Amino acid sequence: NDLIYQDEHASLQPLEGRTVAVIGYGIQGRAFAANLRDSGVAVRVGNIDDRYFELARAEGHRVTNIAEAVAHADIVLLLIPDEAHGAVFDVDIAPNLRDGALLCVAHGHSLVQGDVRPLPGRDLAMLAPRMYGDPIRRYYLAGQGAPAYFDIVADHTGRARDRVLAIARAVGFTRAGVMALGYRQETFLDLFQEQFLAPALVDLVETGFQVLVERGFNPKAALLEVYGSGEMGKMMLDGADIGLDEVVALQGSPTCQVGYHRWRGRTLPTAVRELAARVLDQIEGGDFSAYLKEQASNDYASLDDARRAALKRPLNVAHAQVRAAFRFPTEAAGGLYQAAQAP
Amino acid sequence: NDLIYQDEHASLQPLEGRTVAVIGYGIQGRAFAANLRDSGVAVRVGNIDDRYFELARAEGHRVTNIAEAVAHADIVLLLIPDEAHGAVFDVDIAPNLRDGALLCVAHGHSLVQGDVRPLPGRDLAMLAPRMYGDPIRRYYLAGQGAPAYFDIVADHTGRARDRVLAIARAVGFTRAGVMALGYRQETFLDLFQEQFLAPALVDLVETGFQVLVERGFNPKAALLEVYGSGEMGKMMLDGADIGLDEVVALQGSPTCQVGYHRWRGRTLPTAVRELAARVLDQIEGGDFSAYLKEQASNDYASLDDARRAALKRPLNVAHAQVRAAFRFPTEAAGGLYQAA
Ligand SMILES: NC(=O)c1ccc[n+]([C@@H]2O[C@H](COP(=O)([O-])OP(=O)(O)OC[C@H]3O[C@@H](n4cnc5c(N)ncnc54)[C@H](O)[C@@H]3O)[C@@H](O)[C@H]2O)c1
Ligand SMILES: NC(=O)c1ccc[n+]([C@@H]2O[C@H](COP(=O)([O-])OP(=O)(O)OC[C@H]3O[C@@H](n4cnc5c(N)ncnc54)[C@H](O)[C@@H]3O)[C@@H](O)[C@H]2O)c1
Ligand SMILES: O=C(O)C1(C(=O)O)CC1
Ligand SMILES: O=C(O)C1(C(=O)O)CC1
Ligand SMILES: [Mg+2]
Ligand SMILES: [Mg+2]
Ligand SMILES: [Mg+2]
Ligand SMILES: [Mg+2]
């Protein structure tokens, strides 16, 4: 039933002689810009006057204001925060978007809210990666890719689909798989992962730490076991490949497997499933959308306070103590986004 | 304060002219054996007559029964399942362990239950890695390592500490850090991660999947979001480096950060931390030890049924469908454990 594109279902032919304007040079923008350039696609970056403008210049990109980038582009990727879409679309994009040009968003939220809208004579699409920037870039350089969902919202040209999938191939998403999914469903899925799953996973790791520390366990050891060692991370990432219960079957001692299966499906009270439903209601009904616009109206002042408050929590105090005392294995990220060969 | 050993705090000098018997060639045994050999340490494998014996032979090791390996070793690493420690210790190890030899376990359970005990004239220690085999081997080959906890239980020789830490350096654990921790605390801590945290994390991922599917979301998309994409896994592994809240701050869109910080610290009712306490009580009070021994009866037949049942849960049915339709980034594992 599902429509999933891999390398055999896309080509770079539709990008021959075309310029892509990458609007934004943040988590997504930098990854798209780097992968597109290395794939032999003509890229220019449109960015406001901030640290990202200078980074784009530092990493060898042709950088201008947003309006000028859009004016000289056949394809425009709008890779800036979703609350900024409305103003940038109205002022910078819509007036400068050429006849037959394609506009892409990496998240359906601005489409659901009507902040980005179809324009006569132009194509509108969602190409939404299921991964953040650093892994999109590392996977690409390894001849691999992150998954993505796509939706052709408007297709005046009749060539929107092949151009979207050509971008997807150039950035490496088709090496994993690019699946058709409506922008509205993508929005709700995406916000659910960020508002229920991620907070609940960290809350669970934190609960583990807090209980162990209170029961007289060495705080450094407690932190390492609940995530600091990387073991829980490796389980979840290896789990993505072969399956979560399968990782336990293959890599777990009999003691570990017996323990795991004793409590598997018995740890959570019904209230967690009930909360998941409540979070979806806030996301679908407009409650979250209103909450977000209030938080954005102050240049995310509340968010800055929350971020600084989070670093004071015992879990993050213990993290700093563990990281100073134990060396964690990491790859050098220095030249990660500088020019490379097509893999 | 905490006693943490790195490469500057250990050497391979104590292993000069010493033979290490790796007892078992499973998840830990294979990684210990491979890393010790590549570090220029003399290694022997002691194993019962099963697939692991043939694998050890296939990967170029000297392989014998457990009794023979122990008899020809200055250091013995007991890397077999914990319920098998008692019988192997009494029949195969204790009668054959040389004067001034060192016995190491990688988990304190058999020490707590008194299935492995101090022997006159001999050293007994725990060196417990905080990671499973494949990552320990990949890390080692990249000039890296995983953390470990160690405990010198009996030191007749007076040289147990430097011999245990020499093993830790040879296998690569000192590249991360090797911290002193009591075998009793290690036991309870290790079982807590396996019995509360790991089940609770998968239970939560499964709850996310089952709610999305129930609400009419694309099952493949639902599965990908809750872990299948690798995004949740990458967050947790990157989080080990820089902190979980910090990953969100660095890698999250403003929309993501606002959503995250709305429910952060508010998702779990008090009942979750209460169940965590109950799991620890079972681990500390002997309830789990009794359960494990019952489960070990008839070569873990109950566990075999649980493993087969797990593969048929909606989550794992959806995983197989996703993994068939979406290619995941993997690294070649062929000859990962062959000589470097
Ligand atoms: N974070 C991710 O990994 C990720 C994943 C998939 C989808 N997305 C989507 O990609 C888009 C970009 O998100 P991101 O995480 O890269 O964001 P980010 O916070 O990294 O964005 C920074 C970029 O946005 C620009 N910017 C910020 N405020 C602006 C404004 N008012 N006007 C113009 N430009 C402004 C900055 O100059 C910079 O180039 C969003 O639609 C988001 O939902 C992000
Ligand atoms: N699994 C891990 O990654 C991990 C991590 C840290 C600590 N440990 C500890 O390492 C030890 C070994 O665990 P593992 O995960 O490698 O186990 P495993 O399931 O991989 O063990 C298989 C090995 O044990 C041998 N074996 C099995 N039953 C035996 C028996 N009755 N008598 C003799 N040999 C027998 C097999 O021949 C084989 O060599 C345990 O004490 C465990 O707690 C394991
Ligand atoms: O680290 C441990 O203890 C594991 C085990 O199987 O015992 C790998 C999980
Ligand atoms: O910040 C975002 O929006 C993420 C996404 O995948 O949508 C990275 C989490
Ligand atoms: Mg997402
Ligand atoms: Mg998002
Ligand atoms: Mg264990
Ligand atoms: Mg462990």
From TrEMBL, chain B:
Residues holding ADP: 25, 47, 50
Record flagged with keyword NADP: yes
Stored InterPro entries: 6-PGluconate_DH-like_C_sf, Ado_hCys_hydrolase_NAD-bd, KARI, KARI_C, KARI_N, NAD(P)-bd_dom_sf
Key words of the record: Amino-acid biosynthesis, Branched-chain amino acid biosynthesis, Magnesium, Metal-binding, NADP, Nucleotide-binding, Oxidoreductase
Residue sites binding NAD(+) per the record: 25, 27-28, 47, 50, 82, 251
Catalysis performed (reactions): (2R)-2,3-dihydroxy-3-methylbutanoate + NADP(+) = (2S)-2-acetolactate + NADPH + H(+)
Superkingdom of the source species: Bacteria
Binding, Mg(2+) 1: 190, 194
Pathway: Amino-acid biosynthesis; L-isoleucine biosynthesis; L-isoleucine from 2-oxobutanoate: step 2/4; Amino-acid biosynthesis; L-valine biosynthesis; L-valine from pyruvate: step 2/4
SMART domains with a match to the protein in the record: AdoHcyase_NAD (SM00997)
Protein family according to the UniProt entry: Belongs to the ketol-acid reductoisomerase family.
Classification via PANTHER family: KETOL-ACID REDUCTOISOMERASE, MITOCHONDRIAL
Name of this protein: Ketol-acid reductoisomerase (NADP(+))
Origin species: Burkholderia thailandensis (strain ATCC 700388 / DSM 13276 / CCUG 48851 / CIP 106301 / E264)
Classification of source organism: Bacteria, Pseudomonadati, Pseudomonadota, Betaproteobacteria, Burkholderiales
